[PDB]
Amino acid sequence: NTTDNIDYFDISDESNYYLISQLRPHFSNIYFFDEFKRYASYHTEIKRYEDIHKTKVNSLLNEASRAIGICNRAKNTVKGLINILENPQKFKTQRESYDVKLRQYEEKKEAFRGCLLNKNRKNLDQIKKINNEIRDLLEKLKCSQDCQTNVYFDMIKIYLVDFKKMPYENYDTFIKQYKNSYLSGVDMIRKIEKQIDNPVTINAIKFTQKEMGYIIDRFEYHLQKVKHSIDQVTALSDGVKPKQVTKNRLKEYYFNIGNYYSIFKFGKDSLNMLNKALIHKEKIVHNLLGELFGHLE
Amino acid sequence: EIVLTQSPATLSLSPGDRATLSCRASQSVTTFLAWYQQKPGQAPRLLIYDVSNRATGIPARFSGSGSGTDFTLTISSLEPEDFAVYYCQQRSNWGLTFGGGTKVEIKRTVAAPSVFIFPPSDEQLKSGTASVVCLLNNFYPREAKVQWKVDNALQSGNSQESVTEQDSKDSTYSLSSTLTLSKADYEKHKVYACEVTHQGLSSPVTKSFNRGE
Amino acid sequence: EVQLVESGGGLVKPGGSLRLSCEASGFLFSSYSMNWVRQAPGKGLEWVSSITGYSSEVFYTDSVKGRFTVSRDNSKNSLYLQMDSLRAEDTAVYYCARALTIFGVVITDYWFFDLWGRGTLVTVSSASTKGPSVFPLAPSSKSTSGGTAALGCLVKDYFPEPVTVSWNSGALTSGVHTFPAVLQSSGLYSLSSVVTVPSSSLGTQTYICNVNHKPSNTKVDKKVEP
């Protein structure tokens, strides 16, 4: 009944365009930049990226991990604060109320989440800059209204092979069952907390249920986005396939399927983390529920 | 610095015509060029970004074309509102540079200026300076030559002139030339004339006055 | 409402310093890059400097490199320009401009300007603030045209810009041509405001020349009698 990893916490900025994760590469835009270096492979006019793209994105990623590493002192502050609210035995050692200690969790949690953003603010402009350098680089293609779609649909074929490698329904019925068994106990404690006069364990259960909710909606959020990614590129394969498009439409294309794939890789990374986090939180509530029903004397 | 030349420096067309302005660059700027519009007493207004993309809210009559060094802004059929100055600007290389800008103006019938000359006031000469003012009133086109003669001696180097914006009611410009000489130099000579030349005049008219007369 | 409001303009001697502000409202200030564009009187647009959304990078034109500095406070939705060691050629109207950013599948922007402010005037000259002296450019029966007579009002030697000249406190507006000022060799400004009137009206109707110079706090009313 102790949480050793709090990587499930995340925050997006006021743009709602940048979602910061504790897992590498912290920005889904990094995966999109990796996919563009595979786009410049097939085009002879912009093969210079393979040298200029790697030197640019690698420093953005290295600064992204540097930014999140600064908040480690604040990361451990709430990692040790939820270990007190989760464990009644560890809570019975300190000498402060549950509400007074719960406000320390909330205040220091926002400090940790807010730190992840403030340290990455100057990186938010660096992503916009590389996006521009990617768009302007595509202007060097020796086409105007005759740009070739061959490489555009080659990546579509490869992406749907990579997307079937993940079992979507395995994640879908997992969270549906865990959410059904989550609200079960939420609507349950509220109906039995008055029969058993025990405030130490039930307060710890409601808190571990509060974080269980947050982790769940983070799972359903990333689950939809990888579902939306898979459905959209599938329709691109089942849709019209012209041989020639304007140079601006091709830039729309690479940015479309490039972002579609980065959301898939970013979601699949956090979905597996949230899975291991949900089961760990559920193991805590299950055993502190057994202590509530195991001592009827 | 990547300079942007915009010749023709000015266009004189009428509503319904087609204005096709140019902007040429020293170095090549690919297709990273923008077009702005500025009216007197107002801020510039973004018209087109990256050669051919129209900004939001601006009418469809504004078109964009060009690549490399030679670029073109096209207004299909001009409207009374479209008459202003148009600047081009590049974002390719640092040291962001603008073009010289070219003003489009309303073309009307040639109108001759009403010319007037004012002797310096007696209160001004009571201090040390002397200003003779020549006013060219409501003429078109703007191109006008204002020659200052003092005792039929061609003057140069002591004149200053200022011109108005094209009027919103009659589409006419107006000039005010101010020849400011010394008080000692003013009392030395007697006859002061303002010789103007305009396309609306058969021959250069002259307005003159004799000192103290 | 979406707007940019500049502030802090004024007048200083060569080598002095001023700080211009710009308060944005109506949009999320942090997501946009910001710029400064200046326009000399009667001249064209010149880009001064630029700053990114979160002050990650800043850039300057060569003429102000080492003399100016740009800073932004996204908490106060404010853009700043610190102008140190000013020169004569720095006299211009400075504009606050917003960088054109696009919100599609990703955020991207151009180094163009989609939003502008009204701008403020910055004048750098060793000349001191001086009130305008106004002289009547009186009409005469010899200089009259067919049926029109021209009378004016020369606003001579003032500093700095601008002046406002009206006739009969606003009752006379038609036929009026207030001309742009010229910067004399003396460093002082000077202009003339004329009006074309019927020649028959000279002996009966009065013409009052109202000038207002706010920097020097002077207001002059010169009656121009023939």
Residue numbers in the entry:
A (entry chain J): 170 to 466
B (entry chain L): 6 to 218
C (entry chain K): 6 to 231
Q: What do the study authors state?
A:
The parasite adhesin P. vivax Reticulocyte Binding Protein 2b (PvRBP2b) binds to Transferrin Receptor 1 (TfR1) and Transferrin (Tf) on the surface of reticulocytes, which is critical for red cell invasion. PvRBP2b interacts with TfR1 through its C-terminal domain (residues 461–633) with a buried surface area of ~1271 Å2, and with Tf through its N-terminal domain (residues 168–460) with a buried surface area of ~386 Å211. Here, we isolate and characterize anti-PvRBP2b human monoclonal antibodies from two individuals in Cambodia with natural P. vivax infection. To further elucidate how human mAbs recognized PvRBP2b, we structurally characterized several antibody Fab fragments in complex with PvRBP2b169–470. We were able to determine eight crystal structures of PvRBP2b169–470 with antibody Fabs with resolutions ranging from 2.45 to 3.45 Å—PvRBP2b-241242 (3.15 Å), PvRBP2b-258259 (3.05 Å), PvRBP2b-273264 (2.55 Å), PvRBP2b-253245 (3.45 Å), PvRBP2b-237235 (2.45 Å), PvRBP2b-243244 (3.35 Å), PvRBP2b-251249 (2.90 Å) and PvRBP2b-283284 (3.15 Å).
251249 contacts PvRBP2b169–470 at helices α3 and α7 and the N-terminal loop between E183 and Y187. It binds just adjacent to the Tf binding site. 251249 is 59% inhibitory in the reticulocyte-binding assay and inhibitory in the IP assay, but not in the FRET assay and appears to act through interference with Tf binding. The PvRBP2b-251249 crystal structure shows that this antibody binds adjacent to the Tf interaction site. PvRBP2b-251249 shows steric hindrance with Tf when superimposed onto the ternary complex. HDX-MS shows protection of the loop between residues F178-Y186, which is part of the interface with Tf (Figs. 4b(v) and 5b). Therefore, 251249 may destabilize the interaction between PvRBP2b and Tf. Disruption of Tf binding may result in an intermediate inhibitory phenotype as 251249 shows 59% inhibition in the reticulocyte-binding assay compared to the >98% inhibition observed with human mAbs that sterically hinder TfR1 binding. The third loop that is sandwiched between the two loops showing HDX changes is unfortunately not amenable to analysis by HDX-MS due to the lack of high-quality peptides that cover this region. Antibodies 251249 and 252248 show HDX changes in a loop that extends from the Tf binding interface of PvRBP2b, encompassing residues 178–186 (Fig. 4b(viii)). 3E9 shows steric hindrance with 241242, 253245, 258259, 273264, and 283284, while 6H1 shows steric hindrance with 251249.
